[PDB]
Design an enzyme around this catalytic site. Structure first.
Site, PDB file in Angstrom:
ATOM      1  N   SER A 149      10.777  -2.340 -16.328  1.00 14.74           N
ATOM      2  CA  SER A 149      11.596  -2.705 -15.186  1.00 14.74           C
ATOM      3  C   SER A 149      12.112  -4.125 -15.367  1.00 14.74           C
ATOM      4  O   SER A 149      11.488  -4.959 -16.031  1.00 14.74           O
ATOM      5  CB  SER A 149      10.803  -2.589 -13.884  1.00 14.74           C
ATOM      6  N   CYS A 150      13.260  -4.399 -14.763  1.00 13.60           N
ATOM      7  CA  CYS A 150      13.904  -5.692 -14.912  1.00 13.60           C
ATOM      8  C   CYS A 150      14.393  -6.167 -13.552  1.00 13.60           C
ATOM      9  O   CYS A 150      14.888  -5.373 -12.748  1.00 13.60           O
ATOM     10  CB  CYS A 150      15.060  -5.590 -15.916  1.00 13.60           C
ATOM     11  SG  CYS A 150      16.065  -7.057 -16.094  1.00 13.60           S
TER      12      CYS A 150
END
Lengths: 248, 269, 238, 258, 251, 261
Positions: free
Chosen positions: E168-169
């Site tokens: 995830s970012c």
């Protein structure tokens, strides 16, 4: 054996008839008949009749009427109640025959009351007409499809309906009874699809199911419209909106 | 409360019953109950029963049968004739209830004849579970969906059916009579489509019309198979083979505005 | 430089000639030439000739013959044996030149025997080109005479579907021609089936390759029955 | 019978062999054999062998070596000269036989020079011939296929592999590059590299299952039909790149991949 | 060194700490740490903490919460207000450091209040390492010299199969460094991506260019997207965009 | 009521004006006007004027010039400097009006100097005889067919101003950038296209029926428009003339969306 001889035959039959009533569809064939009738007998001795009914759309009726006016003909619209006949209403495989029978009956009553000697149609040399006594002078003069094209060019005819229209009965199974509502729902469904850029389309009626027939080469481009077509055809009364994998 | 209490409740209730017959679906819930029954009561005091019928495919029955053996249970196959019941034969909106009732009746007959004190499961009239006396000890122990997962990992459970099965009756409209031939026709059509690489599919039966439901993200890839699918389902007995432009579970992916429009449209039938 | 001024020059040009033989392809250009020849010189002083050969389809030959009669012309079929020429038979890069020599030799030979003063073609003697007809001028004038019917798809010699050096046979031509007619019937008017022995290499306009997917399997099996072992699509397009 | 019974057979067969050499490809089947051998006999009595050659890609060789080490095995690379045999050089239909013989001959020498009692491979009931697919894989009297002896099917291989927590392996089954050349065509270092670079490019675009069939100046690309719809956006890039690799025409097979 | 020696190091370090708080992301590294803490110290002496905030999706939080509970851990959600710090709100290249600093500070307060001797994270051997050291958190995988190969090997040995494989970012990456983050444009980007993922496109970015949304999809998926053009167009406009666009370059 | 009755009105209106100047764009409407003007008044009483400017392409100018002369008109080129007007240069929402004012001002000076009684345009001080004769779009096509008019611009031409947001200043560089991008797209087989300028973002509008075909061109268009100066090359998911083909509900919703800007 020559186009001049075939056109000569047609002129002679028209001169003999004197006054005619012409069943005008707007196609090349009826365009050719009506333009020779006007040229040979004059505007006052030809009546173009365009049928309006439940089995065809208002668009084709308006287009056929305006084309006849564009030729310089006196044009009169007549409405047929095809659904009054149980063969048409219950869609038997003989539905077209009783539709043509009811159409030619109305044409003879118009022809009887305007003094015409015959009803003329567009049929060329490739049933309900012969029973009515209507005359297909193109077919009597041995006009083939190529002779219709040659003479239309000779008379400068350029404008006619290139799309052959077909009765909405074909979108219902033989068992299915046609109603004013399911016909209208089928007609609005095809008109919408056409507006997206698919001129050749059928919306086959299967109760709650619409079965859309498209040319297979167009189905890939069609995907962008799947959701819009689904919800729009459901708003028109279908419960399921489907695409036939066999195509048109 | 604690997962220790969820398992303690379960352990105490199983030790209570001494001998049980377990309705085994192959799903995680029935997998979990079966191995807790085996761990607490032993193989000689547990009978796993997997239903075989016309409403489900041979693959899941054979898959469910071997998984129960993998847990170490003594397993019993039983064949049910759901179509003998007219509610099922005629596909009424209550068909599921009479299917469950006929199933729990056979389970109660099997349990009475082997020596079990109860039939265990994972989760119009009296409730088919309660009318028969079937006990859902997972729900009595207040297991939530994650705790089944938490305890299943704790006990080393690894092979189970993650695919939720659905009765083939769902591919027929309410009112349509199910036959051995149209069931077989639907089953072969869906199996053909799965062999082309579409694991999530429905072939809805509308007499002469097959209505195929696919996930919309797959419909673009599907075109390469149009002609083969058309001719194959026609050989299976369909006259027209169609693709639903709404997709599988229509409306599940539309925008907010047209999701409610599709909902009120279906609310008319 | 008006269509009226361009048509006057063309009508006058024909007028001088008196009798003409017209190379009629069935396209809009030669159709306009033939019907101005008919309108100016009369039917009895115009001979339309349509070439039939192994390098072009029977369909375009039949369509060109019927179209010329539709304009009211006396039409004459002529058969050219292009494969009798070793340059054409072996498909050299100059094969086109030896084909054109046989074509114009036969028409000059027809024109010599019917009393014609010149052979005319439709190129945009090219009296359409001498009158500076552009594509826009042909469309307006052909409509001006009520012409609607002509062959809109321009044909190309089947030689282009074989590599240079390859010997042309009646069967490899028939195999290529049948494959293209099938593909056109699927709704792809612009197509080439390039012949590489066991491999068919199909060329489509890149804008159409997306539409083609629904036909992959049917096209694969159909062209294999026509004699190919592998049926492929060129990713570079047409 | 049950998967527990199939695994018991396998454990007993390993305990009886005591020390083994395992032919390790990195696929699911070979991972299950290698990890049961390690679990039963220990790292000191298992030698994992990964073949390097001109007929298989360096990519899967590097991946199989790292996986075998990841499994806790002592793993050994060995490089085979398939092209040294003229039966393989000229790609005859009987090429698979001389490739398999040369492969298993090298493994027996490795097993002979360590203390192993047998060569083990990944072959299961049914299964495919790795040099010539479509010829059902079979036998090899010089090696032991304990998965096939225990009646492991493809479904039992998954079930037991998940049971042991094995997650990482090569999911696309590899086939000798010989299959991309017609029978009779001589194999070269240049045409192999040409085909291998082309497939490697195609795999980098997101197509793990691909064949670039070699027809001299013609590349004939085979993709799974379910993926051909996704491929359209890559037409021009694939056309140019495979042309720079030496093909003159770059084509897509309308039949798809086998 | 051997993986057995590295695992012994890991076990001994945990045995010494007795009671621990684990920052749990759901990745391979955090899953291995959390599982060894449970295996060595027992469920009663491990607290898994999952951060919830505006910069990440509720979907990733829920899955991280479910993974920790599946491992047999007591897992605790904590909500961070990243935009309360202006270093984060102004979307500078060092914003991630102040996000990590706020995160480890909250973890220290949780560990202080439940009796843990240390905060543990998933970081391994070979960055956002400075914030970890300032807060005194411990990366036991890195102290035991676990590399990627050792993490994967030990996860197989303990039968760990399920973890979050998609990294995830932070949503800041959908805004240029010049654009300051607000609660509305974040919500707008997150709802747009959440809708797009719901159509079957797990890998997606909706890049924010004020009135223009620029959608990035993997090129191999763009062909599948056509059936959704109209629905995506109007839904992202209802979220506030004026133009909804697809990047021909892809993801 | 009838096309004959509308055409009679058209014939009579021309006879009264005797000599006219026709603003000729090459579309169906102006081609119809110019060809009825020639037939009624003769080549000596009508001059065709085609505008050349920086806001339209050399292709659209040349086609209008070749079509008007081919129909037998005396054709006259006039060059307009639309960018000299700050309303046009800075692209205000009323910019089109100041472009029309500058063009019709020039046409009146030509009309004053050639002896014309009126300036005629194609609409359905200036006179729109199609609109006075109650010609609708369907009557234009029906009558255009009747005179054998076949060549007209089938893709409607639009000023390049429409590719720039209101407020953005038009330069020779950004105009050329937009015109080069659209011309490239047209060469790939997309005659109806818009490349909307949003500084570093190009937003491509295509007819939705064509977007399926476009996928094969994604990478070529991305690189080519990037070399033209765009940093991101994007495709508008609404397409060209958005909402025109949608269903009843979503056409109404998109019209609400469009009305909020």
């Amino acid at each position: 054996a020559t186009l001049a001889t075939k056109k000569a035959t047609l002129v002679a039959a028209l001169k003999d008839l004197q006054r005619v009533t012409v069943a005008f569809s707007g196609g090349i064939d009826s365009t050719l008949v009506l333009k020779m009738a006007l040229d040979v007998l004059g505007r006052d001795n030809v009546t173009a009749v365009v049928a309006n009914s439940e089995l065809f759309t208002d668009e084709e009726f308006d287009k056929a009427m305006s084309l006849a006016e564009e030729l310089g003909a006196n044009v009169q619209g007549t409405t047929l109640d095809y659904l009054s006949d149980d063969h048409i209403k219950n869609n038997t495989p003989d539905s077209w025959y009783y539709a043509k029978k009811m159409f030619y009956s109305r044409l003879n009553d118009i022809a009887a009351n305007n003094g015409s000697a015959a009803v003329l149609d567009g049929m060329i040399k490739n049933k309900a007409r012969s029973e009515a006594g209507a005359r297909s002078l193109l077919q009597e003069a041995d006009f083939f499809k190529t002779d219709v094209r040659a003479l239309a060019q000779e008379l400068g005819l350029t404008n006619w309906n290139k799309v052959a229209s077909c009765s909405v009965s074909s979108r219902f199974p033989y068992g299915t009874t046609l109603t004013h509502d399911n016909i209208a729902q089928v007609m609005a469904a095809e008109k919408y699809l056409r507006s997206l850029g698919f001129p050749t389309v059928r919306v086959r009626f299967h109760n709650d199911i619409a079965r859309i027939e498209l040319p297979e080469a167009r189905i890939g481009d069609f995907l962008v419209f799947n959701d819009r077509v689904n919800r729009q055809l459901q708003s028109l009364g279908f419960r399921y909106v489907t695409l036939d994998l066999g195509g048109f």
